[PDB]
Design an enzyme around this catalytic site. Structure first.
Site, PDB file in Angstrom:
ATOM      1  N   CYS A  90       0.838  -1.199   0.000  1.00 56.06           N
ATOM      2  CA  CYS A  90       0.000   0.000   0.000  1.00 56.06           C
ATOM      3  C   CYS A  90       0.881   1.260   0.000  1.00 56.06           C
ATOM      4  O   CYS A  90       0.592   2.246  -0.694  1.00 56.06           O
ATOM      5  CB  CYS A  90      -0.926   0.005   1.229  1.00 56.06           C
ATOM      6  SG  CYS A  90      -2.159  -1.357   1.307  1.00 56.06           S
ATOM      7  N   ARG A 132      -7.536  -4.321  -3.498  1.00 55.62           N
ATOM      8  CA  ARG A 132      -7.035  -3.125  -4.166  1.00 55.62           C
ATOM      9  C   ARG A 132      -7.957  -2.783  -5.320  1.00 55.62           C
ATOM     10  O   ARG A 132      -7.722  -3.172  -6.465  1.00 55.62           O
ATOM     11  CB  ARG A 132      -5.599  -3.351  -4.655  1.00 55.62           C
ATOM     12  CG  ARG A 132      -4.630  -3.607  -3.503  1.00 55.62           C
ATOM     13  CD  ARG A 132      -3.190  -3.912  -3.950  1.00 55.62           C
ATOM     14  NE  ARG A 132      -2.469  -4.465  -2.812  1.00 55.62           N
ATOM     15  CZ  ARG A 132      -2.054  -3.749  -1.771  1.00 55.62           C
ATOM     16  NH1 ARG A 132      -2.210  -2.432  -1.755  1.00 55.62           N
ATOM     17  NH2 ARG A 132      -1.438  -4.345  -0.767  1.00 55.62           N
TER      18      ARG A 132
END
Lengths: 214, 214, 214, 214, 214, 214, 214, 214, 214
Positions: free
Chosen positions: E45, E120
């Site tokens: 991330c 995601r």
């Protein structure tokens, strides 16, 4: 759906563009014969299109517009139509509906049991949006557009003249090309039929089976 | 119901007694053509019965047994059959179902919109009890038993020889009386068709449109 | 339905044409006797039609209109009525309903359990469209129109005069052709009945059993 | 459908024959990348088929079998595949599903709102039948098979080596082609990461951000 | 949700305060790219937030605003942004949604099956509040923000010029950076294409595969 | 849930790993104090963690294990705990649950109306898995761990010696640290209390208000 | 019910007469603390009533009115209050609800599992009828009204000055009696916090942990 | 039904005619006692009618009208009353309801389990149509009208004087024929009772037990 | 609940401990009289307890055990009983149910319209658990235990000897202390009744009204 039932209000994408059924035809004061075929680029379907195209003017001359449909998409339709033109020099000039997900097909019961494509269905619809006849032939057996033509000619005359057509009209085994008078259904109507026969206005085998020329 | 579906298990009263469909016929290894008519003692229906009797032998010869039906009772049937004998000199020898309350007619979608009697339906059922074709003509237009005859001949042939029949077979505009090979539906089947024609063995307009004489 | 209930509003197709019940008769200020029969061209039913026709004017003179009903179609109805004139030289002149799918029959409980045709039911309906009596006989046992005539005569007199009819009236074993006064239902009315006796204007076995000449 | 979910059991007709998903590939211990396209004989779809064919052995080499689909029928598929061959000199050799009525398409949410055909979806399924990634591009924008390839390469590696892949791996702006160790998620794991750093067994920005070479 | 659907109206809490979607951006006449990440203080991330910040101005040039989301709380978001700043000398300046209970995440199908955090996901939404594209990559595989850029550039031009983009545009293997004209879908449109080519401003592989330069 | 109910069987992810409650503690014959706080990196919550830690061993000696809960994720938890060490020189050593989507929080009613995060809840659970006491404080008001200590101590003695504890025990205004004998609830029990008073083995204000020294 | 919920509109019978909650208190602009006890004439409950009465004036001073509850009837309540005066020289002067059948008790979750009487619950409701805090102690363990006094004092200041109170306020281990500023929840607020400090009028351990004196 | 409810609006048929309950008595400002008996021509029931008739004027003077009920029909009621007259030389002059199908009996719970007739029920209903008392004796045990008389007298006084009647009033073992003042239910009322006591118009055993001469 | 219905299986808390009804009494081969009173520490209720105690041994002698019930708690019950002992020198020795939430009261319909406490109900249940009689007096009117005693005595004798008790037995206006022979209910029983009289054995007023000395 069933005979006598008005054709459902539905928008369809076709090789001639997006149209509204039955409106597109009824507003022109025309009848239409919707017929399906299992799939583009298949033999029997191809012979039926050649056959229908060879007769398109006959149906049109009667004021009946042919329109087809299958669960293929419009681009395939056009490429299949082009194939027919390049190989059989026949130019399809009637619209063909691209029922992408077979939504209209299912609604009209054109999809056979356990299948995901249509069979060979025919729906005769008049200028009032009323379904007048329905035929479901299987994928393995091609139709005979000449019988469908006899059917619609009979349908037009029935509506126009208020008479019924005998078996195999205009070539009935008993009365040739004569037409039938709807049967009397009351004691009073029975009397009228008998008086009508007396005056030589009609011919008959009995009070309920009267017939005459057009 | 729709094409491909198995005819429903039903017990019916006929002019030949109480029987169970489709069992009565399938257990005899027989196909059967069920057809309805609006009502006994009505003109068009009578011409259709006469027309059917004239062709019954041709149907039975193919192992297909005709059986009619209407919403009238069995006593009227026999009385009407008697009238046909006394007035048209022909004896109906095929059973006729007395669908008293139209329970079966409704289940087979034979009742037109707003009506309480049947239209002119036709159901072709094979010896496996599967509905192979369906026709719905309106009360005002009699059928043509010759087209139905052609239909069943096509059906018997496609089932027995694994072929498909072209439009208006055996008088197709493109391949006369020749039959059609079910279209290849895989890359491999396609290759097999392209080579199959590399040396006789089969004719074709394309790899998906192959045909031959039967 | 049950006694005391308003005959249902319904449209029926008969040998005399389409009519709305009970409207058609109630607006004429007449009562009607709706009776059903299993099937056309059946023996017991035929004998009951003969029986009814020979008594029709007796009912009509009482302001009671007979109307039949069967699950057959109207054409057979007329064919049957014709057989009756040609073989029994009797002219049926009361309307007969063609309850095509037994819809009205079912609503009126006229169809026996495990049957698809009506039994032998009778419904007496007065000018108010009220069901006053109901009878259900089986297919194997014909009715006796004379007992029904006695029923309607008792019903009209009951309404008109405000009295009750004893067993087997007008031939009752105990009081003959005399009628019954509805029984006192209160302590005070009992007193009125007792004073109406002994230097009274009425006959009785007890305060609750009072009778008199019509 | 959502990531991590099991690919639904379903029978599909493809240009290579009828198969069952995901079983067909999973029973073979294989992965597969199912992708859709709006329709046969459309430009963007053709450029993508060209692009995918050019990369098929790349995915196959990884144990990932590509399989396409549109709501067109198989005959149309084969013909389109023929067109690509005769006009782009490339032979599509991966199967293509004929989702006749978009049944599977709707199941996998491939159909955009208001549409009756698929958009450009991609599903990555592993040998366990689990959906590992999903992409939905609209009809107006073709995909980029190279990104999809990078995607499957990262998936295969993370599964076999128990590592995570940074942004734009193997060309990450921060750690080039090094991979990420799943972050310590307990006080104890944090300890073993700080200790693994003290002995140069790993590189890190912090205890939760450790990475290494393959 | 699916492509074509209008992004749901929702109030979200972000590092830049409380805002309403899609309004906050639509009223500015801007598009926005909503993307999620499993959790704050995790390696992959972090590499994606770095990659996104380095490309934030290229997205902004096209009038597209990036906005993140995870099920972490706002205070953690800010501390993580603070970490990135102090350890990578990069300042995050796009808003990040604190979807506390993952309510929005679930509405948008961002939570993998059997998980409690998002995967995601990437949602491209245009100035009309319409979802134009959706991407779901798993926690173990970082995205490639350059592919998203290519995707958004194509989307913008598609909407402006009414064209479609070929595979890998502007680097398509067949036509490079040339764009595609939406395929003719009617017989009439096909004719316009054939005339547009033969002596005209259109290049093509077939009547359905036409293209031009921007 | 309410006092008396057994704590729900649930698996939770914590700073010390994934554990199953209440099993994790009950198997060790331990009691546990589950408390929640709105969010990591927030002031009041930090002051409560500092206070709890300074009292952790006091709870542990009583066989009671503390365990926190927040709607934040585990990585933020460990980051926040790290902040406490580096800024307050205090080492948090009790596990903290990462209730990602507040599922456990909602099950235990820890989410105030209209909120998406927990309030300041406290649940005391015994070695049998039974919830013994519940406290719900709002976000704006920190708790006082000393009162929870009093609560827990009284709870342990109550279960071990079958006595009840008075207001503010062991500093009750009326009896200081003496404990209460569950009140007699039957006529016979009332007699055995009035006796216990006689042979001074119990002190009392009335038969139902008896107390003694531990 | 949960913190933040409006106290349910309900009428209750008390030792001071029938009153409407929460109106009776809110219309006076006062707060109230509703607390329950298992039953009248029980020891712990008695010590708690004595304890509450000695603090009633302190609660009253803060504009908070205590009001009891139990499932006993009002008559027993008065006899018990009388016992308390006669044996403890204290005069209960706050209302006590006679929740006859425990309907309000069930409504507010005061009944422990398997019981038919309340536990020791406490609800703090503000002048707006909003439940600000909830406490559920079991029957075997009496409360400490001093903690509830601290709770209500903090609740009032918090509402009055818009600040939060740290653990054990006003005796916080870290910041004594200073109050906390609600944490900055945006990038902008964090900035204004850093400006408020460092050459400013605010103390803090970090940007999210700022505090000051009243 | 239960004490306190409005007697149901119902039209009933009685030996005195058709009337509407409770209206028939209430609109007259009279109370009434509805009592049922198992059946006409039954021994216990007869002794109760004889018993009631002998006390009718006692009830009537208090403005209370007796009315009987059984599931027998009105004519039997009269014959039974007549029987009672001819054999017990007493004249029944109170009305008796003919609850033909026990509809009212069931609605009033007068039908014991497993039975189809009523037991010996008694309903005292006041001029406001409110049910004030209900008794249900079994078929095998006759009632004692004098107790019902004491009951109605107490009920009336209670309504007029607003007092309660002690056990066996007016022959109570403790206060003889004195009446009871409804118990104080608030602190304030307890004060007034103690004031009235100390030199006043009130005698008592405690503040909740006040009584006086009527 | 109604007469003849079995008493519901239920566990109750009483001043004598926790017991199960009707088991506790039925297992001892005893009957029991359940009676409720509005509330402890109320005047009428207290006079009824005094009255019942003075007659307890009279009921106990017939094998009938009295047991009371109110919606008060057991502690209050015992204190009320203690008050009765201290002021009226009478000791309650029958158990009293603490129907804390009035759940049993409701189930037995002891709660008048719009109330939250029981009225004055009496239930006589025999040694088989069958409710034999039910009485519902209002709060404002005390009962008369001497009538209940008469009821019970009459009830025991009807069960033991199979006879019925006339009005006000043993002081009936017609047959004094004699009992009633249940009425003949068949033609054959009517015969024997006349036979039974023809030669002593029984005295009678008619075949249905037979009585004899006990």
């Amino acid at each position: 759906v069933v005979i006598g039932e008005k054709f459902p209000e539905v928008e369809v994408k076709t090789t001639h563009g997006v149209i509204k059924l039955p409106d597109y035809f009824t507003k022109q004061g025309k009848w239409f014969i919707l017929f399906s075929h299992p799939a583009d680029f298949t033999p029997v379907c191809t012979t039926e299109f050649y056959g229908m195209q060879k007769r398109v003017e006959e149906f049109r001359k009667l004021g009946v517009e042919p329109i087809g449909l299958s669960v293929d998409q419009v681009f395939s339709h056009i490429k299949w139509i082009e194939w027919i033109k390049d190989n059989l020099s026949v130019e399809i000039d009637f619209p063909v509906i691209a029922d992408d997900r077979g939504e209209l097909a299912e609604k009209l019961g054109m999809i056979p049991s356990g299948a995901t494509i249509t069979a060979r269905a025919v729906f005769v619809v008049d200028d009032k949006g009323i379904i007048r006849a329905i035929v479901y032939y299987p994928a393995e057996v091609g139709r005979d557009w000449d019988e469908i033509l006899r059917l619609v000619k009979a349908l037009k005359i029935s509506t126009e003249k208020g008479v019924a057509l005998p078996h195999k009209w205009p070539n009935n085994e008993l009365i040739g090309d004569k037409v039938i008078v709807p049967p009397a259904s009351t004691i009073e109507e029975k009397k009228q039929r008998e008086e009508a026969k007396a005056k030589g206005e009609i011919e008959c085998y009995d009070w309920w089976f009267c017939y005459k020329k057009l």
